[PDB]
Amino acid sequence: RRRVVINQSNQSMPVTSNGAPLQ
Amino acid sequence: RRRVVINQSNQSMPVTSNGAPLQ
Amino acid sequence: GTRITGLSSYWERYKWLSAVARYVPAVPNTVACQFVMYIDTDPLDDPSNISD
Amino acid sequence: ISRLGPDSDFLTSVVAKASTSIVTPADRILVKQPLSASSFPGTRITGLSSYWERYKWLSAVARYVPAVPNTVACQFVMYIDTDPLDDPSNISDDNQIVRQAVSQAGSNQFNFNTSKTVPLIVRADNQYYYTGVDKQNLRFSLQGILYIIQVTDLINFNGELITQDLTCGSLFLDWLVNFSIPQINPTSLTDVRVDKAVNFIKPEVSGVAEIQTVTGLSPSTSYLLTPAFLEQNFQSEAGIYILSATPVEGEGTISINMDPTVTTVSGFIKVKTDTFGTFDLSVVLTTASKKQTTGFNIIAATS
Amino acid sequence: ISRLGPDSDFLTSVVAKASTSIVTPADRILVKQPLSASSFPGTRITGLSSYWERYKWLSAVARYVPAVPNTVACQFVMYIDTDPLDDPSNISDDNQIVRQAVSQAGSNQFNFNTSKTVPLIVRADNQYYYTGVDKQNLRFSLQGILYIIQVTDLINFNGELITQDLTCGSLFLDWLVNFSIPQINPTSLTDVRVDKAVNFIKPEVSGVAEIQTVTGLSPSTSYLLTPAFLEQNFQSEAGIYILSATPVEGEGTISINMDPTVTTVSGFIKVKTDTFGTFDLSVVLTTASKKQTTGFNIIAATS
Ligand SMILES: [Ca+2]
Ligand SMILES: [Ca+2]
Ligand SMILES: [Ca+2]
Ligand SMILES: [Ca+2]
Ligand SMILES: [Ca+2]
């Protein structure tokens, strides 16, 4: 047989964006 | 007489605005 | 150094289902150079022996 | 019926020009790039174009990116002339050539600090155009000609004009084609280039061939070898410089005969490298005491 | 994936050999032709192979036509060995090398003056072999190798043995492919070749540049020029044979300086033709009274 276990040994890293004006 | 035909021999040009931050 | 390389040697095989590499700069808008970024799928195609 | 795409291909790098390099209104045309598929030699669309007769762009949107900081400023206008023979180069007024641009449908103007695109306007009918090099009439082989017109003097951050011709970005194509009639198109769209020049070795024993192994070349590609030597006094001592170079694998004999009675500087070696980018050839000198260096040029096709 | 085909190509000619040329049973292998996509330079499938990562022959049938009269007879067997590292080149029995051939699936047995076909049998699973030139392991990038084994001695109209080896036919591949993941696939396969060797003109008045137009080349194709000469006495009278050839449009120089204090034979020219296959370049001589002939090769990418 083969089985597909959803492994739960990870962790996320969400990306946020911004940006400064000249003044 | 006088008649006012809507002439359809033109084409548009729409304007979009943006602007880059310092970083 | 990553945990995925640590955990990779506790199974036999792998397959990247989703793999998107996300370039983050650390530079302002005052210097400029153009890059091109890709993932070649053949690990033996090497561009390092091109004379052009 | 052989529909391929959508993909991406790099056309050229665009070079903005200084204010002193602009004299006539014709000098504002930065690029005049034909958008035939057989007109970007080395790219993927041109390599494919030499294996079908006809084509038609279903969607050819040309995507410009900047390669320049946001602290310098100049302004471009960019369009695709669907007629390949309407030439804007004979316009004597500087503003008329850029009103020629924005009047064409599908055109676009932009600051050159940002990424904008120009799509190709489809025809009303269903006409296919030919691939290959342009033989007689351009209206058979070109679907469009991409133009970029500089409308503004190239300024810098310091309030000065740039005095040098500056590469200011790149042009990419997002293409989707049809094709028909698979064939070969007899003119090759590749260009040759002298890859590198390296001298023959100096053998120690007269009339005995020692094998010169050269490295650093690309693996498993065919090369061409022609001799070239510069400023060598062969009559500085006794003897006659007689060289004979043969590959152990390929075909050909490079012969260097510097006898001033009968001169023979001729021959060529066709040989291909192994899997490691190396090859070797039998270098032999009749008079090994003559240590004047002689070189050869490695010819290769780059694209 | 891109499914291209069906189409035809040209592999090679095949030279059936006589009784004396067959000494070992390993000599019976007439052709060892790899049926990867990237192994027939100049053809259509090889040019397309360098624009994708992977290939798979859906239906790839190799076809043979004879180029030989019906008064000579020699039975062939033709098979496509799917394993590219199975090598029949070291089998000691002349009947075992042909039992190994006829037992391959899809093999075909024919007299060599009869046109026949051989189909490639595809895998049961779905493997995409890689395109491009060969690398470390030869089982990653080849789907099959084509072999033609000569199983019987070549014979004449009267039943006596032919004493000379004979080019006898040609192989044509009728193919159908998938491709995947477009790349430009470096280390291109375009081999260069000397197009022709044409010599310079001999102008009248020294120190004068003249225009030598050379004709009969391919239109709008880029060439490469390397200097050459053969068996010339550059000291037959007073003066030093100095020559310099520069194009009017191209790039580079040619220098023929036969000064015995500093002798220089170097330089190259990259120039392309017009629509007529012609071009021109500026030849100057410092002593035009000295009529030593001098040549130059024309290097061109053939495909
Ligand atoms: Ca690759
Ligand atoms: Ca054509
Ligand atoms: Ca027009
Ligand atoms: Ca044709
Ligand atoms: Ca590859």
UniProtKB/TrEMBL annotation, chains A, B:
Top-level taxon in the UniProt lineage: Viruses
UniProt protein name: Capsid protein
Upper taxonomic lineage: Viruses, Riboviria, Orthornavirae, Kitrinoviricota, Magsaviricetes
